[PDB]
Write a structure and sequence with these properties.
This protein has 388 residues and is of the alpha+beta class. The chain folds into three domains: 197 residues, Rossmann fold (3-Layer(aba) Sandwich), CATH 3.40.50; 95 residues, Translation factors (Elongation Factor Tu (Ef-tu), domain 3, Beta Barrel); 93 residues, Beta Barrel (Elongation Factor Tu (Ef-tu), domain 3). The protein is built from seven helices and 26 strands. Bound molecules: guanosine-5'-diphosphate and magnesium ion. Magnesium ion binds next to α1. It is classed as translation. Keywords: translation elongation factor, translation, GTP binding, GDP, G protein, GTPASE, magnesium, structural genomics, National Institute of Allergy and Infectious Diseases, csgid, Center for Structural Genomics of Infectious Diseases.
């Protein structure tokens, strides 16, 4: 297994996302080996349902000389919003498709802003439909506009790879600069510009607490899934969230009928904690390497509000709405502040909001959450920025 990289095509409708996706898959198959996909196979995106939220996504796979890519393409504007806000497709990089004829358009800007909000780490640009523009100064002008638009949202527009091509020429089997060579140039940009994502085992240790036990003859044990890093018996951990942060030592690690020396990312296990009582640990707190994650009550978020068809509200909510925010394992009530001038949010919409929780939660930007009322999911969010 070589590097596996998650990517996707973003950009305004009709700018050439599905055509480019089909061209990449077909040309990589012909060049490096794999399966070719045509336009109709990718334009028809299957439906996959998870928590009532319906997202239509097309998934294609293709190989570079050294990597295997998983690529997502979406039919509608709402599909891209839901896919990016939730953790459905965790893109390691996004391919921004922009038509050289019309230039950046409203959904071009929204998709860059969304990528910033949800934490898309890198963006590569395919400047498409260059077969329709013969003036190279006009191509330069639109490229400059795309780079500046990227920098407006804190992406490094001056260093961004911008590949000029015609996804339709490439899919049709054309040669020349805008044909197959341009799609191979884009694949070479994916290989050179997007690093392999850091392994969970290499990150700082983090384990959300799911259950707590007072075991007679042993002491206090917390159970959960290790999300990141490694914890060894004898090392210190912080208990972060809900209550003031405290620090203790791990004195044991175990799985069912298996005593362990350490707990590793992906493992579900129990952790024995020195000098701790059951009332000091609780669900919704996390164990973490000391000093690597901080509790917060205030944060900004990007939020998709479920439509009534997805089991959400069928009425708008107002500024000052106080639902529950479900973080990892538990609900915390929080008050919502909308952008200035915004008084209500419609179901089916996505908005940027500020939140103040009634108790702190350990969080970094990129943490996903659900918004619930009465235990019914009414929204999905991602922490865009922690307020301090
Ligand atoms: N002339 C030209 N047309 C293109 C190119 N790429 C896509 N198109 C056309 O633009 C229309 C929309 O393309 P599509 O891939 O469905 O755009 P999407 O909405 O972003 O997925 C289709 O009619 C394509 O054939 C190109 O490089 N040159
Ligand atoms: Mg499409």
């Amino acid at each position: 297994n070589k590097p596996h990289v998650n990517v996707g095509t973003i950009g305004h409708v009709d700018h050439g996302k599905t055509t480019l996706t089909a061209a990449i898959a077909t040309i990589c198959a012909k060049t490096y080996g794999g399966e070719a996909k045509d336009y109709s196979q990718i334009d028809s995106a299957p439906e996959e349902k998870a928590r009532g939220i319906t997202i239509n996504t097309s998934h294609v796979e293709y190989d570079s000389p050294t990597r295997h890519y998983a690529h997502v393409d979406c039919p509608g504007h709402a599909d891209y919003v839901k896919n990016m806000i939730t953790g459905a497709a965790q893109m390691d990089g996004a391919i921004l498709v922009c038509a050289a004829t019309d230039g950046p358009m409203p959904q071009t800007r929204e998709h860059i802003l969304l990528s910033r909000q949800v934490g898309v780490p890198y963006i590569i640009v395919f400047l498409n439909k260059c077969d329709l523009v013969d003036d190279e100064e006009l191509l330069e002008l639109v490229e400059m506009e795309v780079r500046e638009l990227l920098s407006t949202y804190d992406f490094p527009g001056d260093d961004t790879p911008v590949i000029r091509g015609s996804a339709l020429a490439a899919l049709n089997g054309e040669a020349g600069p805008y044909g197959e060579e341009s799609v191979l140039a884009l694949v070479a940009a994916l290989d050179s510009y997007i690093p392999e994502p850091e392994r969970a085992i290499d990150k700082a240790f983090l384990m959300p607490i799911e259950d707590v036990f007072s075991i007679s003859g042993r002491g206090t044990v917390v159970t959960g899934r290790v999300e990141a890093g490694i914890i060894k018996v004898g090392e210190e951990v912080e208990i972060v969230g809900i209550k003031d942060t405290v620090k203790t030592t791990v004195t044991g690690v175990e799985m069912f009928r298996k005593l362990l020396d350490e707990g590793r990312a992906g493992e579900n296990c129990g952790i024995l904690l020195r000098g701790t009582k059951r009332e000091e640990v609780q669900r919704g707190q996390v164990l973490a390497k000391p000093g690597t994650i901080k509790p917060h009550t205030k944060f900004d978020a990007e939020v998709y509000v479920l439509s009534k068809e997805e089991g959400g509200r069928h009425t708008p909510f107002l500024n000052g709405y106080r639902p529950q925010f479900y973080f990892r394992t538990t609900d915390v009530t929080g008050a919502i502040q909308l952008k200035e001038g915004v008084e209500m949010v419609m179901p089916g919409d996505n908005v940027e909001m500020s939140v103040e929780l009634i108790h702190p939660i350990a969080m970094d930007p990129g943490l996903r959450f659900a918004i619930r009322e009465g235990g019914r999911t009414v929204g999905a969010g991602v922490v865009a920025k922690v307020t301090a």
